């Protein structure tokens, strides 16, 4: 059964990933992804993009990771999944920092911030302020950095 194989690949991919077998995680998640597309299973397709992006981070392939996180972001928006939209924006902000593309990093970190505030995810808001302060400082934008450094301090005391 092709559907059972899709489940099995998704499970194998996750286990390889957690064992540090990132190459073999990619091989398995790609087959999960293909089978998800065959069956029109958008939930599984989205999940596979996110797990692929994560594996490529640990393979050091940051541009490839960004391509998979952009795919996850698109699908999360289509599915109206705000928490997953936020997660993929945070992963993109970090990925663009690894690529030393601070303008794109700031874009996606601001997107994550907005959703974390809407969702009352205060811990996530603190992460966003940490990340944004760091990025603005890397660029010399110290008035923006001040705003987010103050907010990181305030949140750091709460959660």
């Amino acid at each position: 059964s092709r559907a059972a194989q899709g489940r099995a690949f998704g499970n194998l991919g996750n286990t390889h990933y957690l064992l540090g077998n990132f190459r073999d995680a990619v091989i398995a998640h790609e087959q999960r992804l293909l089978i998800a597309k065959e069956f029109g299973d958008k939930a599984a397709e989205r999940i596979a993009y996110s797990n692929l992006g994560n594996a490529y981070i640990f393979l050091g392939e940051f541009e490839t990771a960004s391509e998979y996180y952009k795919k996850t972001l698109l699908l999360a928006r289509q599915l109206k999944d705000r928490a997953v939209e936020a997660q993929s924006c945070y992963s993109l902000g970090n990925t663009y920092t690894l690529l030393q593309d601070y303008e794109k990093a700031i874009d996606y970190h601001l997107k994550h911030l907005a959703i974390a505030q809407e969702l009352k995810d205060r811990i996530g808001e603190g992460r966003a302020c940490w990340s944004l302060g760091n990025a603005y400082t890397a660029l010399g934008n110290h008035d923006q950095a001040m705003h987010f450094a103050e907010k990181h301090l305030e949140i750091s005391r709460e959660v």
């Binding site: 996750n14 990933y17 957690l18 999940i47 996110s50 797990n51 994560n54 981070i57 640990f58 945070y90 992963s91 970090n94 920092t97 690894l98 992460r127 940490w130 990340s131 760091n134």
Partner: peptide, 17 residues
Amino acid sequence: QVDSVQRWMEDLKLMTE
């Protein structure tokens, strides 16, 4: 390394869906 990125990666190593 950027400390916030390091932390994100430490969490990411444990993350699956």
